[PDB]
């Protein structure tokens, strides 16, 4: 904990230097931070081990950084590692040695796995363990006894209090191993789901499933892959391995439709088995081997309609061998987490790309679903060509003097509209779309503010999507945008920031955002991150633009929301000005137009 | 540069400097490409030649080289038109030159120079010497204001730190030579020795100062014979720069850590690596301290780890660009003192005053539409006198 003169954590009295440090690329500080070198000959082997034990903090193209936490270590033991194996290899990789504090810390968080297990059978939850002593210790805990239903020893626990039981179990250093033995579970009938030979999983896809199915039993946890990596295929493959009834929980009506399409494309399951449970319609959820729905539908708290209530009754009174939870990072929400207890599932598989939140509830996924089974490196996949290369940029748009006059004076939360509706920002967006459209690029424009979304959509006369738009109408636009050459640019809102599959969307633009939402930014960039047909690894196939207003609060949020992407190696080139704007017939070229716009913005309030 | 320094000298000192043959050879060597040949031509000639002949000896192509070399040597006063014979002393002295009349050292120079840099920064463990302390303070790169308390670093001192060791040493020597005359040390003696080194009481004091800087080393309890180091005649990088404003300095010396800490925040310390983050607060502080962005990029650029060398640009453009924006951010408001003139009732005369202000060079900004202009207070009286004259 010694601090140098330059506010630096001095760790020279803590650890020594290994003589053969040149070959060893790893540093291990007593704080737990691990600095791995990406240019070392042995990077590949170290990265796989390190990512499992420690969640990456920042992974630039040259030197990566990882942090050690109890939850991160708990994932290592689950996949198959052991304290002796981890510390031994860690010492082998360390070019300075493992400090005594960290060495004991690793051991401390490895003697807790396997002590207690959670088993669901016959619509009943039991706390299973082969050691009575640990069970007895749990019973001493007050809340553990409170949630109890009102050799190997098992005591039944009420379903409604599973969350509290799991949370306290971690707090008691006795994580519950919610591991599903699908291969030895004949009670639930095996579904006809099968992986067609035409579907081949990429090495990262297979590796992620290997951790899930390291042993005969199936592991429940969170698998993180970059947007567009193909998490749909991995989720479908997980159902194929389980061969049991599968429930898929998307984010919206678009997610389930894409989930339905992916299953048909990447699996032999017949269309009749596939079903949807959404407000728009339902494909007979009562009879279906695979169920696709959304957190809103299942997590709806108020009384359900008769059509939805009947499906909900069936869903509650069912046993699921695999519950795929798309967009896991939304699970820790107050109500969306309840969906886990509402539905009875043996193994909960979580698919997501941005395992970050502005709150501290992201850690709850460790016990709500399970440990982070896998986390692919964005740059590794980007170089491999699995995801299109993106040249992230931040277009700096100077604020209009008339607007800034009001923005500085106004502070009653009306600034967001003022600097979101910047005529200078509008011109850059207008010019960029024209230039990129001429290059046969499929543009996507995002805007958190619907007002701004509407203002720009009509002015540029381009399709726009947000809340009130019906599922069919928004689905129609995507199909047109996907295939119709005429619809080269589309406008989207917070609705389509996640789960929108647009493989050909080369260019992306953002004119508004909800604060410093790293999740929003990374998810928003994900839309164009899908692999392109004629993609080349080092040609910057896709592009991302985050228009910002200079000398404005937007600048702070732009930096805040760029934290995650830069942690993954993405560099946000700053574009102070755009060439060719002057010679372009762009809107708001006169003060009268800008003056008129300012009054409208003020009127909106 | 060395040639630049010689040009800024009087003819009297120059001829005095043209003493023993080694000096003439040293001054000859810096003749770029052309003037060297001219020197050999009119070396055995005792009769001046027309200036026209010199002009026509260089083809029309590359003519600019003919004039620039002639201008350079005219500044050096090697010859005179004499109406272009060389200096008789130079011709004779040069003729004397032209057939007439280790590993420990580099480490010592590097270490001895480093301790001076250690003293430059607030390093408690640094060489202490009253003569050295006043030398740096009088060199224009340091200021004490209190002999009892250790001196601080001036705005230029911080910039001097980031400069590369060759340029860092040369600038110090250039300042030392200029201050040598002021303190009473003859410039010719020290300057002539430097030329002789490349191959009296004043020299003894000068030699001691050179020993202090580590350029020269007697090794025999200050004997007559001295062994100049590599730096006296006139390295792999260790910093990895990340796109996320992170510097991993593979440094074992405390000075380099001190240098990097000037414009970045140090996070962790390891024997062969130090984690530093280039935060805008640190950079803005470094710029405020006196540093210039280009130096920061150059300082990181020169000390670039080999792994980054293959990449082009070696420094990621975003990091370089972001640093510049941080510098340009501070100077958004360009404050400039001036005197504003308004109520220009005489619209016709306003242009005449505008022309008069432009002629004097005092006008800074003007607005014809509003009929107003701003003039620096230095020239305010002149324009005020002009207005009063009417």
């Amino acid at each position: 904990t010694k601090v140098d003169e330059y506010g630096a954590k001095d760790y020279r009295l803590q650890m020594p230097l290994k003589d053969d440090h040149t070959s060893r690329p790893l540093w291990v500080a007593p704080d737990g931070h691990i600095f791995l070198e990406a240019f070392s000959p042995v990077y590949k082997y170290a990265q796989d081990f390190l990512v499992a034990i420690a969640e990456p903090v920042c992974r630039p193209t040259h030197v990566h950084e990882y942090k050690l936490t109890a939850y991160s270590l708990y994932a290592a033991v689950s996949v198959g590692l052991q304290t002796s194996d981890i510390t031994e290899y860690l010492r082998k990789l360390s070019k300075t040695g493992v400090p005594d504090g960290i060495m004991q810390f690793i051991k401390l968080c490895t003697v807790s796995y396997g002590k207690v297990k959670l088993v669901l059978k016959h619509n009943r939850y039991f706390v299973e363990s082969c050691h009575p002593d640990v069970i007895q210790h749990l019973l001493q805990d007050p809340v553990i006894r409170e949630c109890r239903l009102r050799q190997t020893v098992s005591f039944e626990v009420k379903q409604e209090m599973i969350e509290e039981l799991q949370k306290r179990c971690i707090h008691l250093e006795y994580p519950l191993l919610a591991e599903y033995d699908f291969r030895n579970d004949s009670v639930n009938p095996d579904i006809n789901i099968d992986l067609k030979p035409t579907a081949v999983l990429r090495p990262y896809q297979e590796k992620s499933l290997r951790k899930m199915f390291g042993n005969g039993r199936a592991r429940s946890g969170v698998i993180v892959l970059p947007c567009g990596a193909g998490k749909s295929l991995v989720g479908v493959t997980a159902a194929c391995t389980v061969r049991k009834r599968c429930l898929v929980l998307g984010n919206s009506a678009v997610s389930v439709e894409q989930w339905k399409a992916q299953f048909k494309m990447w699996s032999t399951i017949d269309d009749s088995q596939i079903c949807r449970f959404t407000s728009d319609a339902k494909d007979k959820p009562i009879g279906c081997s695979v169920a696709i729905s959304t957190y809103s539908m299942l997590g709806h708290t108020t009384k359900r309609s008769w059509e939805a209530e009947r499906v909900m009754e069936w869903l509650k009174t069912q046993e699921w061998g695999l519950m795929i939870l798309d967009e896991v990072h939304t699970i820790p929400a107050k109500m969306f987490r309840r969906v886990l207890t509402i539905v009875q599932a043996h193994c909960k598989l979580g698919l997501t790309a941005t395992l970050v939140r502005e709150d501290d509830k992201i850690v709850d996924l460790n016990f709500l679903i399970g440990p982070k089974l896998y986390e692919a490196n964005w740059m590794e996949l980007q170089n491999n060509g699995y995801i299109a290369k993106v040249q992230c940029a931040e277009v700096w748009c100077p604020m209009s003097p008339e607007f800034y006059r009001e923005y500085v004076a106004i502070k009653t939360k009306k600034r967001i509209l003022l600097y979101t509706m910047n005529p200078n920002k509008f011109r850059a967006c207008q010019f960029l779309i024209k230039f990129h459209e001429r290059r046969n690029d499929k543009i996507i424009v995002f805007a958190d503010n619907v007002f701004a979304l509407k203002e720009y959509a009509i002015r540029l006369n381009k399709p726009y999507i947000y809340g009130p738009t019906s599922q069919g109408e928004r689905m129609q636009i995507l199909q047109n945008f996907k295939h119709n050459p005429k619809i080269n640019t589309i406008f989207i809102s917070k609705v389509g920031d996640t789960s929108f599959d647009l493989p050909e969307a080369n260019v992306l633009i953002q004119i508004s955002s909800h604060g410093g939402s790293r999740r929003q930014e990374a998810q928003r960039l994900g839309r164009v991150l899908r692999a392109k047909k004629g993609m080349v690894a080092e040609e910057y196939n896709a592009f991302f633009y985050s228009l910002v207003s200079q000398d404005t609060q937007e600048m702070a949020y732009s930096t805040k929301r760029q934290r995650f992407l830069v942690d993954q190696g993405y560099s946000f080139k700053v574009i102070t000005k755009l060439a060719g704007m002057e010679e372009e017939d762009l809107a708001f070229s006169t003060k009268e137009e800008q003056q008129q716009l300012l009054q409208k913005v003020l009127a909106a309030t | 540069n060395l040639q630049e320094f010689l040009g800024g000298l009087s003819p009297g000192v120059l001829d005095r400097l043209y003493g023993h043959p080694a000096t003439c050879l040293a001054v000859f060597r810096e003749l770029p490409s052309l003037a060297k040949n001219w020197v050999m031509r009119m070396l055995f000639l005792e009769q001046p030649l027309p200036q026209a002949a010199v002009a026509l000896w260089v083809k029309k192509e590359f003519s600019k080289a003919q004039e620039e070399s002639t201008g350079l040597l005219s500044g050096l006063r090697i010859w005179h038109t004499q109406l272009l014979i060389l200096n008789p002393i130079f011709r004779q002295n040069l003729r004397i030159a032209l057939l007439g009349g280790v590993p420990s050292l580099d480490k010592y120079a590097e270490e001895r120079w480093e301790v001076v840099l250690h003293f430059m920064v607030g390093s408690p463990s640094a060489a202490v010497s009253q003569d050295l302390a006043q030398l740096l303070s009088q060199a224009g790169l340091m200021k004490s204001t209190e002999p009892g308390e250790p001196p601080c670093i001036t705005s230029a001192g911080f910039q001097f730190l980031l400069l590369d060791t060759p340029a860092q040493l040369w600038y110090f020597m250039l300042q030392y030579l200029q201050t040598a005359q002021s303190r009473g040390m003859d410039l010719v003696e020290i300057l002539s020795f430097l030329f002789q080194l490349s191959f009296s009481d004043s020299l003894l004091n000068f030699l001691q100062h050179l020993r202090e800087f580590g350029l020269v080393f007697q090794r025999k309890r200050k004997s007559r014979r001295y062994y100049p180091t590599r730096l006296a005649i006139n390295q792999p990088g260790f910093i990895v720069v990340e796109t996320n404003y992170r510097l991993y300095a593979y440094t074992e010396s405390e000075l380099q850590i001190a240098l990097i800490a000037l414009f970045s925040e140090m996070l962790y310390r390891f024997p062969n690596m130090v984690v530093a983050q280039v935060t805008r607060e640190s950079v803005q502080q470094a710029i405020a301290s006196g540093i210039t962005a280009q130096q920061i990029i150059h300082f990181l650029r020169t000390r670039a780890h080999p792994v980054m060398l293959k990449q082009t640009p070696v420094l990621p453009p975003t990091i370089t660009d972001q640093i510049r924006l941080w510098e340009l951010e501070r100077d958004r408001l360009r404050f400039t003192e001036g005197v504003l003139y308004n109520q220009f009732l005489s619209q016709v005369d306003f242009e005449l005053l505008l022309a008069h202000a432009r002629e004097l060079g005092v006008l800074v900004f003007e607005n014809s539409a509003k009929r107003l202009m701003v003039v620096t207070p230095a020239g305010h009286s002149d324009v005020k006198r002009f207005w009063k004259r009417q």
């Binding site: 040249q391 940029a393 230039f435 290059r439 046969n440 910057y540 592009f543 080139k573 700053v574 574009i575 102070t576 000005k577 755009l578 060439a579 060719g580 | 962005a293 280009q294 453009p317 370089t320 660009d321 510049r324 924006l325 510098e327 340009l328």
Partner: peptide, 15 residues
Amino acid sequence: AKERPIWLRESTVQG
């Protein structure tokens, strides 16, 4: 063959 724009290709900073 659809090269990148000037602003993306090269730095736009005055310095």
